[PDB]
Amino acid sequence: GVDIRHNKDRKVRRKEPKSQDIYLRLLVKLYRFLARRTNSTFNQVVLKRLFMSRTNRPPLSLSRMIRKMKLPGREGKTAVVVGTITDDVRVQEVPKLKVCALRVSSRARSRILKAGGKILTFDQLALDSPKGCGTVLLSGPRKGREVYRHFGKAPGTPHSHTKPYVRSKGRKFERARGRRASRGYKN
Amino acid sequence: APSRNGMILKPHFHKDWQRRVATWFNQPARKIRRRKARQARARRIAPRPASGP
Amino acid sequence: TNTKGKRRGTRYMFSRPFRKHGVVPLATYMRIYKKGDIVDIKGMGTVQKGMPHKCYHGKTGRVYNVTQHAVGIVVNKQVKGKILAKRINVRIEHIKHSKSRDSFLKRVKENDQKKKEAKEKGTWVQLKRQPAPPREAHFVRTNGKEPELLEPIPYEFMA
Amino acid sequence: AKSKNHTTHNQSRKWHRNGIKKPRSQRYESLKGVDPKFLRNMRFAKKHNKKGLKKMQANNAKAMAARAEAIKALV
Amino acid sequence: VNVPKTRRTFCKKCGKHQPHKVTQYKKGKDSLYAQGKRRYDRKQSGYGGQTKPIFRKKAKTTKKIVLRLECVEPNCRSKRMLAIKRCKHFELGGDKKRKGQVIQ
RNA sequence: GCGCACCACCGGCCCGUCUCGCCCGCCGCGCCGGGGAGGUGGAGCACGAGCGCACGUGUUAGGACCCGAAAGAUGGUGAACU
RNA sequence: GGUAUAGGGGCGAAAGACUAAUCGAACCAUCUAGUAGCUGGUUCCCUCCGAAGUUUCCCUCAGGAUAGCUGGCGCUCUCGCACACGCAGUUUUAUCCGGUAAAGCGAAUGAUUAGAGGUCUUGGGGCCGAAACGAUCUCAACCUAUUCUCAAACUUUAAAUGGGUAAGAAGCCCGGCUCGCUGGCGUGAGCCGGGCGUGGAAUGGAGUGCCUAGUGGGCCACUUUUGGUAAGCAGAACUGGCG
RNA sequence: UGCCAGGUGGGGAGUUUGACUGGGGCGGUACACCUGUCAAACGGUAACGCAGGUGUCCUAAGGCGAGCUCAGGGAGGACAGAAACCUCCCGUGGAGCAGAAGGGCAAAAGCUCGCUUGAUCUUGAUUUUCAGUACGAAUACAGACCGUGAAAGCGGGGCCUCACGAUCCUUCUGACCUUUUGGGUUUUAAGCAGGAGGUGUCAGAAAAGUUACCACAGGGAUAACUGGCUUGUGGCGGCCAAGCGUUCAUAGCGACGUCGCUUUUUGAUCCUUCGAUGUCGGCUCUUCCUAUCAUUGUGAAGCAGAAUUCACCAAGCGUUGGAUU
RNA sequence: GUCUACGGCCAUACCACCCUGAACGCGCCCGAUCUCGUCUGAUCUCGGAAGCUAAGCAGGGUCGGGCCUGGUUAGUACUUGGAUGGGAGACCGCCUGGGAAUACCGGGUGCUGUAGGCUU
Ligand SMILES: [Mg+2]
Ligand SMILES: [Mg+2]
Ligand SMILES: [Mg+2]
Ligand SMILES: [Mg+2]
Ligand SMILES: [Mg+2]
Ligand SMILES: [Mg+2]
Ligand SMILES: [Mg+2]
Ligand SMILES: [Mg+2]
Ligand SMILES: [Mg+2]
Ligand SMILES: [Mg+2]
Ligand SMILES: [Mg+2]
Ligand SMILES: [Mg+2]
Ligand SMILES: [Mg+2]
Ligand SMILES: [Mg+2]
Ligand SMILES: [Mg+2]
Ligand SMILES: [Mg+2]
Ligand SMILES: [Mg+2]
Ligand SMILES: [Mg+2]
Ligand SMILES: [Mg+2]
Ligand SMILES: [Mg+2]
Ligand SMILES: [Mg+2]
Ligand SMILES: [Mg+2]
Ligand SMILES: [Zn+2]
Fold this sequence. Notes:
It is classed as rna binding protein. The structure is cut from a larger assembly and holds chains A (about 190 residues), B (about 55 residues), C (about 160 residues), D (about 80 residues) and E (about 100 residues). Chain A has about 190 residues and is an alpha/beta fold. Chain A is built from five helices and seven strands; from the N terminus they run ααβαββββαβαβ. In chain A, helix 1 packs antiparallel against helix 2. Chain B contains one helix and no strands. Chain E contains one helix and six strands. Chain E has one helix spanning about 35-45, and strands spanning about 1-5, 5-10, 15-25, 65-70, 80-85, 90. Chains C and D meet through strand 2 and strand 4 of C and loops of D. One magnesium ion binds near residues 7 and 10 of chain A. Chain C binds four RNA strands through strand 1, strand 2, strand 3, strand 4 and helix 1.
């Protein structure tokens, strides 16, 4: 008889990708070997992000990647993204960059190749930089999805700015008793 | 009964809607019949445009 | 069930002690309370304005805001599931400096002195506190006189 | 059909099951609840911090030079 | 309660404290053509009987007193409503009672 | 040292509203239009992430996991018993 | 035997009687699979985690919503990869809070027993007196020093147990800027630059975000405790169990 | 006659007839609030627990500044006495502060004066119940107009703990406010913001009874039996001994007190039973208990005999026939 | 040694009675034209310095009361945690730790900040 709680003994973190596509499985096997053998933690982070779901690796915009590469010191380094590189249309000047990503949009691929940059896959990254030396690891905005605007403190609560679940926004659908000082009260 | 922040929904299924359900299994047959009628009408006026005036 | 009165059950809590009624001493009125000062709240029945609630009596908090004759204190309060760090406005008469932090400040100053000193000496000094150790075995000298016998006293009914 | 009125028997176990937490203290607490005049003065002070920045830069450079000279003198 | 017939208080239009005339507010006429009244008249027409509730459980024995403050300054004449706590006896200029006299 | 994502805070911007104010323009100089500073209200901006399909769970409208009333309404049949 | 009266109708010397074995509203078909917060039932195995009968609101009390308890899915980090941040139904060292147990009423309020000294004060019966504070006691409410017994809605005192904080990097020590705030000079706050790291004991890897079922009749026991003569009675607090 | 309008209209139709509750009804509100206790020295904590109170009142009983000290007691002064007014002294508040109670207050927060309406207009933040949502109440601020005082300051109602109300609708107040739809002007109307008209079942339905002619879904969550815990009450038995007994407490009794037993009385509880356990009596029949009426064997006398009662082993055998109900 | 003005802690500072005060100072005290307010220059306000410690005030004394601080009461009352401890119960003892309050008996009877005087 030993008094130990078993409610938090099984950890919930992912061990393998839930997708059944085979190319991702091959990349997972390659980076499993690299992470379990090489002492580099970059391979561990890449493996963990490869295990992640669609919402856990949001797409990275071209403008954000350019701005991140604009920082001093990280010049002539390979961009590593485990998500998708998406074209940004409200930017004009695109420099030459070395990018590694699972997916690159056709517009983004064309603009990157036009500027003289290079686009590589993760199997090419393993051949080029097996330990991930001289690379900048980036990711998209995790809180970019519209679901997080509905998360947090409940609406109708003081000092809360959470979007309620409404069928349609309008004059007579909300903003009444509970939100108007003239109608009962407001929070 | 509401439960922890769901949308307020008002389905319009309070009448006897199952009596007046309109299926669309007739859609491919309808398209084939329309195409046959269109071809027959085009053939009837041999030199005139099939679209019309 | 009990009433929801604000001052219910404060018959003795918000009452001046014996032979200490009358004019409030002016020392409490002219003490400053900077931001980040640890302060313990004790209500006073003489002043009715700025009265803290009975649940904050005896609690200790930190000052974050100051007004002309009142300060804002953030005090932890447990409500049946959790501890809430909530901010209240309390007048000066119900506010006094807490002496819990001054001992720590004095020990910090002494440790800084012991760090600056004995550094060129080369001998490291013990800065951490330790609990009471064993009583450092010694000798007891019963010079001449023998120990006195203590026999139990026979019972007798006194009532 | 009278029933039980009120109790707090099993509540403590429920409270302590999910690790009753002291509120999470975070550095740089918010300024909500402070007197408006003091906030207005602080905002005006921060608004003009950029003014006279070259004086701060020159003083910092002079202090750095003095510190370097003192380090060289010590060595 | 007793309140005076004159009240020198703030005036929103003037922007300063001005003397005001004090009168008791009273309910007006329904005008027979409000949107709610027209809707109620249309709903009550026809068959079906009474369509809206009729309150029949009066409990309070007094109403809240409302004071009509009218600015006496010419070219302003701005009115304003002020409510005072409930009381069952109200008057204006009501017998300032001359504290310290003989009561008979 | 450059510092992803994210968190906390301090600033900035957009719309409504309140207070104090100084100026700008004209096709029509007016009960014209525009701008500032300081608080506040918004499901906002602040270099994006949605769309479509499929699967699972949870809440509903429907007969609604299955069986169960005392009732109500519409239209017809009975004085071969009494 | 023929004929007439048909269902909110008929008929009734009146029983709510009869109206095809049904009548305080007949039978047949349909609306209709009417509604039920109420009973009953609800179909294979193994593995893992694992509850509540509690707060608030509801014409709410055999029911719901809402917090609480539970599960699942993750994510952000640290590391027995010689090299640890942070948190605790714990204790220690400091520093605040209380008015219960106890005790007191020779201290306040209230209750209350009896003797000594008081025309303190006045008054009733009385006795020696026309009367007399002239002698003697007595009963009245009071006093002067004592004395017996009490208070959940009394208290000068006053525990054990208990409840907040502090035990450092988000801390200290210097230099300089900003302020439509406050000020005689000054404050106070906010911005930048520089220098100093095991801050009591022992144990834990932590933090954070979404959905989420069931529950919302409880009961018993040590201890404290309310009503009741008492109850395997009714009702509370802490902890532990059955459920 | 046809169509409108007003009255009448249980002849007829639809519907309603709250909740808590030591079963329900009746009785009360423990249904919305406040004070002390319960409550076990943070806080919070139940019962149809205890003692009470509230739906008001105040142009001053709000806000400033000044001046005094109250209740009570003693000593005195023409009428004048226990209480009329004046003087002196003692007086920690034993008075007063509107109310119920608690806390607090002495050159006040009480009394008397002088001036006023901070009981004014407007953004936010926080506290009480709390889900940490509203309402009410309150707390520190800030921006204008003020009041008062020489000034420091104080005041945006009452010294504090309570005295009150959502949606919809109506009504009033305000802007040289928006719309009033093809455009323009004018009435009207609809909006924006702030008050009021009210829901006492007080987070807020518009609501009378009876059914013994009754029905349905349930409930032993809930009553009327027995049976269970308890014994207040009923019944029965002891302990001490003031007295009755002509004398003498105990032959026979026994007050004032106190300790017990039984469930053959009525009570309290709701534990089993509401998909049903056939009730009050009487008749018939068996068995069991002793707290013994009689018989057998004995102890005691206010036992001379007879008779009588007290007590012991003791339930073997007996404890009847009728008028009334 | 000490006083005055403004104070801090608010009786070790209060209350009752008695004794002593050199100098400065604090007051008593002398009057109501001006300032001011009363039924009364009683209070307040103003104008002064003929007398005084009479009083306030300061110091000291009471086998003084009170107040503050100790011993006793007492390891008593009470109390955290424990037992298949005792007892019919009422209650009590023990183990492990903490630990009171009356009566009674001792000690003490204000320290101190700023500025300005006197004893030169
Ligand atoms: Mg066509
Ligand atoms: Mg009509
Ligand atoms: Mg859901
Ligand atoms: Mg059916
Ligand atoms: Mg019906
Ligand atoms: Mg009948
Ligand atoms: Mg069905
Ligand atoms: Mg129900
Ligand atoms: Mg698990
Ligand atoms: Mg398990
Ligand atoms: Mg006691
Ligand atoms: Mg169960
Ligand atoms: Mg009817
Ligand atoms: Mg009922
Ligand atoms: Mg108490
Ligand atoms: Mg407690
Ligand atoms: Mg005064
Ligand atoms: Mg103001
Ligand atoms: Mg009958
Ligand atoms: Mg039962
Ligand atoms: Mg009896
Ligand atoms: Mg005989
Ligand atoms: Zn005006």
